Each structure stands twice: as structure tokens, then as C-alpha cells.
């Protein structure tokens, strides 16, 4: 699975 | 000897030319197996390796889980581009790129060796998750905005959870489900060609074709002396069918060919080969 | 500031006329990601398939472009690359000895 995406 | 599950994210803005674009690809070692492009009509996570055509029967929620993840990711990097652009006080006129690379390196018996999550802005380092998987390193002052955000939210723990968990578990699923493609150790097809240039000077080119994985070592020798400084080593290329190629060339005194040997090291080789050329 | 692409143009298998093969144009080491890559057949644009965008550990991108091609002696093979780091599109010719 894709990991989590965190917002820059 | 380890294996790797790696993901690559690229999100770049079209400053006046549509919304930003988001592209994500996933690799197990040197083989690509999944993709996502936000430019499609209704964009979905899509298979790119053979064994990924059986993930729908093995995990009926895989495609919708990851499609939802990637479409969500495209939204947050769209906003992320604008945030980072303000961090550097940049105008809306230029195009800028966010890149992300994350994954896990796992030793033989399923043991994690190292996780990572590194990001770049306009091709230069921006922020990276440290090796302890518990803290971040901001590359400049602008990235300290992101690091402070991610620290206070505890994002390193959520990253460590994935890197120690699903990353290892899915690298293992992929390795086993795709043993035919992934555990392959194909040796190269090796041969030496020839191109004289003078009545007096000649090029010896040592080829290696159709090998997997990508790691390979080509060395030219003269009477057992390494000629690395004097050879032309081309960058390894994708053969178009999941394998790779690379050649090493030398320019030799004409007539003195049989004193030159090509040393080839590959994983899928019984032992390193020593190649002479012969009429 | 933009990184300029490196270009190799090749066939997958040792080529001889008649026998069909696969012509590839490997473009790597560039930045920003936008580019135009086409394989030209006698100066004319073929229809091709482009790989998915990925990048190396130095953050430079690489792309593979390819098409089924049938070697002849009467026709020429070139790959036309354009990028912001170039003053004008660069054309590389497929040489039977890459």
C-alpha cells in the first residue's frame, strides 16, 4: 500500500 | 542481501496551464509494479507488473484503498505546492516541483534494515525522516515550517508505523506473489565487438545485455591491471522488457588485443567472468 | 539551474534488417520534469509509448520511450528531445552500434 501523505 | 519496496512521488505545478499534476510509481527492487497519474479522466492506481493482475482476487480492497490514497495525496500536494511557494516568497508565475521517495530495506528473513521518507523541492533536498525514524531534518529555513508542523502532529510515529509494518508486509507479499519476476537472477548476454579508427588504434566494446537485477560491474584489464580510469563506462539502460544493458569500451594498440580482458560481475552469475576477444 | 538530459538511443536486440525489434530512447539526468520525447522515422513523428515518471537518488528524472521498429537500409532513426535546459530540441540518431 501507499504510505500516508503529509502536508508540507 | 536485501530487497526493497520503494515509492516515488512527483507533483509539479502548471502555473497557468491547468491544475498541478501528480504522478506516483512503486518499485520492488528494480521492477516497477504500480502507477498513478492524476491527469487521467478518473485516475486510478494501476498495475504495471504481471503479479499485480492477481491482487484483485487476493486483496479485493487493494485497488480502491490505494486509488483513494493517491487521489487524496494529489489534493494535499496541490496545496503543499502553494504552501512551499509562500515559504520561499515565490510568485505564482513559475512552475515548481515537489518530489518524495519513501520505502523500506528488508534483510533476508523479513527483518527491517532501514526505512526512509525524503522530500525535495525543485530538485534539492527539503526535509527527510532521520534514520531512527523518529525525527526530521530540514534542509533550509523554509523547510523548518514543515518540520515544525510535522513534529507537533507526531507524523514521524505514523511514518515509523508504516515503514515497520505495511512496508515490510507488502514487500513480502509482493516478493512471494511475484517470485517469478522478482526473485529472478538473470545473467547478462556478454560479447565483445570491435571498431578500428586508425591503422593504429582500435575500440574494444564489452557488452552485457538483458540482465536483472540492474547491479553489475564491468571492468577492463590489461595483463591483469585495472583500466577503470581509461575506459568509457556508459550508464545502465532499461532494455524495454524489464531487463537492463550496459557496455564498457576501451581504445587499445592495434594488434595487441589478446592482452585485454573484460571482467563481468553479476548476481545471477555462477562466478565473475573473464572475457577475451578472439577472431 | 535546470539539469540537462542525457540521451541513449538503441535497439533491444542486436539489429539486422527484416527482423523486427524494439527501438528505445532513454532520457535521464534532467530536471524540471517537463520534456518532449519522440522517436522520429525519417524526420517524421512515430507513435510511441512512454514510461512512467520516476527519478534517481539525486532527484533527476529518467524516462524510457519506445516503439516496435523494423530495421531497413533506406530509413533513418532519430530521437528528438526538448527540455528547458536546451536552447533548442536536440536530435540523436539511432546508430547500429550504440
* Per-residue 3-state assignment (H helix, E strand, C coil) for chain B: CCEEEEEEEEEECCCCCCCCEEEEEEEECCEEEEEEECCCCCCCCEECCHHHHHHHHHCCCHHHHHHHHHHHHHHHHHHHHHHHHHHCCCCCCCCCEEEEEEEEEECCCCCEEEEEEEEEECCEEEEEECCCCCCEEECCCCHHHHHHHHHHCCHHHHHHHHHHCHHHHHHHHHHHHCHHHHCCCECCEEEEEEEECCCCEEEEEEEEEEEECCCEEEEEEECCEECHHHCEECCCEECCCCCEEEEEEEEEECCCHHHEEEEEEECCCCCCEEECCCC
Beta-strand pair B225-226/C49-50 = unpaired
Q: In this complex, do C8 and B241 lie within 8 Å of one another by their Cβ atoms?
A: no
C-alpha C11 chain-centroid distance: 11
Asked if B101 has any chain C CB less than 8 Å from its own CB, the reply is yes
Look up cell 591483469; give the residue: B224
Element (H, E) at C27: strand C21-30
State how far the alpha carbon of B251 is from the alpha carbons of B11, B196, B206, B254, C10, in Å. Answer: 44, 9, 12, 9, 22
C-beta neighbour count of B203 within 10 angstroms:
15
Q: In this complex, do C34 and B235 lie within 8 Å of one another by their Cβ atoms?
A: no
Asked if B229 has any chain C CB less than 8 Å from its own CB, the reply is no
C38, C19, C48: which is closest to C92 by C-alpha? C38
Chains that touch C (3 or more CB pairs under 8 A): B
Asked if B16 has any chain C CB less than 8 Å from its own CB, the reply is no
Helix axes B155-164, B143-152, angle to 10 degrees: 80
State how far the alpha carbon of B93 is from the alpha carbons of B14, B232, C84, in Å. Answer: 9, 42, 16
CA atoms B209, B213, B214, B218: torsion sign: negative
Domain B185-275 has CATH 2.60.40.10: yes
Beta bridge partners of B128: B118, B137
Q: In this complex, do A3 and B150 lie within 8 Å of one another by their Cβ atoms?
A: no
B9, B6, B267: which is closest to B114 by C-alpha? B6
**Alpha helices (H) in chain C, listed in sequence order:** none
Beta-strand pair C61-69/B124-129 = unpaired
Domain ranges within chain B, ordered by starting residue: 1-184, 185-275
State how far the alpha carbon of B236 is from the alpha carbons of B133, B204, B214, B244, C50, in Å. Answer: 32, 18, 8, 7, 18
Beta bridge partners of C23: C11, C67
Resolution of the PDB structure in angstroms: 2.6
Name all domains of chain C by residue range, CATH numbers in brackets.
Answer: 1-98 (2.60.40.10)
Verify cis geometry, omega within 30 degrees of 0, for the bond prior to C7.
no
Asked how this structure was determined, the answer is X-ray
Helix axes B155-164, B166-177, angle to 10 degrees: 30
Asked if C3 has any chain B CB less than 8 Å from its own CB, the reply is yes
Domain B1-184 has CATH 3.30.230.10: no
**Residue of C4, C31, C33 best to disrupt the B interface, most CBs of B under 10 A:** C33
Helix axes B143-152, B62-87, angle to 10 degrees: 130
**Residue of B162, B163, B164, B172 best to disrupt the A interface, most CBs of A under 10 A:** B162
Rounded CA gap, B174 and B168, in Å?
A: 10
Which DSSP letter does residue C3 get? B
A1, C85, C56, C36: which is closest to B99 by C-alpha? C56
Amino acid at each position: 500500500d501507499f504510505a500516508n501523505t503529509f502536508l508540507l | 542481501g536485501f530487497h526493497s519496496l520503494r515509492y516515488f512521488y512527483t507533483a509539479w505545478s502548471r502555473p497557468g496551464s491547468g491544475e498541478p499534476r501528480f504522478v506516483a510509481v512503486g518499485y520492488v527492487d528494480d521492477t516497477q509494479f504500480v502507477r498513478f497519474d492524476s491527469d487521467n479522466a478518473s485516475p486510478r492506481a494501476e498495475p504495471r507488473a504481471p503479479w499485480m493482475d492477481l491482487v484483485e482476487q487476493q486483496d479485493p480492497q487493494y485497488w480502491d484503498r490505494n486509488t483513494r490514497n493517491a487521489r487524496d495525496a494529489a489534493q494535499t500536494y496541490r496545496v503543499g505546492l502553494d504552501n512551499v511557494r509562500g515559504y520561499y516568497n515565490q510568485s505564482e508565475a513559475g512552475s515548481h516541483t515537489i518530489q518524495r521517495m519513501y520505502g523500506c530495506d528488508v534483510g533476508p528473513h523479513g527483518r527491517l534494515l532501514r526505512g526512509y521518507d525524503q522530500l525535495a523541492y525543485d530538485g534539492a533536498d527539503y526535509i527527510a525522516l532521520n534514520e531512527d525514524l523518529r525525527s526530521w531534518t530540514a534542509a533550509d529555513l523554509a523547510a523548518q515550517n514543515t518540520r515544525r508542523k510535522w513534529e507537533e502532529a507526531g507524523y514521524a510515529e505514523r511514518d515509523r508505523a508504516y515503514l515497520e509494518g505495511e512496508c515490510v508486509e507488502w514487500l513480502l507479499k509482493h516478493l512471494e506473489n511475484g517470485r517469478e519476476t522478482l526473485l529472478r537472477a538473470d545473467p547478462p548476454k556478454t560479447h565483445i565487438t570491435h571498431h578500428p579508427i586508425s591503422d593504429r588504434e582500435v575500440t574494444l566494446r564489452c557488452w552485457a545485455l538483458g540482465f536483472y537485477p540492474e547491479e553489475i560491474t564491468l571492468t577492463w584489464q590489461h595483463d591483469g591491471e585495472d583500466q577503470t580510469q581509461e575506459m568509457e563506462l556508459v550508464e545502465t539502460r532499461p532494455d524495454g522488457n524489464g531487463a537492463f544493458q550496459k557496455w564498457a569500451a576501451l581504445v587499445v594498440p592495434s594488434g595487441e588485443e589478446q592482452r585485454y580482458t573484460c571482467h563481468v560481475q553479476h548476481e545471477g552469475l555462477p562466478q565473475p567472468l573473464t572475457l577475451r576477444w578472439e577472431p | 539551474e535546470p539539469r540537462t538530459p542525457k540521451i541513449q538511443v538503441y535497439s533491444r536486440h542486436p539489429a539486422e534488417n527484416g527482423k523486427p525489434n524494439y527501438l528505445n530512447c532513454y532520457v535521464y539526468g534532467f530536471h524540471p520534469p517537463q520534456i518532449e520525447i519522440d522517436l522520429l522515422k525519417n524526420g517524421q513523428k512515430m507513435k510511441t509509448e512512454q514510461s512512467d515518471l520516476s527519478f534517481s537518488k539525486d532527484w533527476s528524472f529518467y524516462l524510457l520511450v519506445h516503439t516496435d521498429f523494423t530495421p531497413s537500409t533506406v530509413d533513418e532513426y532519430s530521437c528528438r528531445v526538448n527540455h528547458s535546459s536546451l536552447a533548442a530540441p536536440h536530435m540523436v540518431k539511432w546508430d547500429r552500434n550504440n
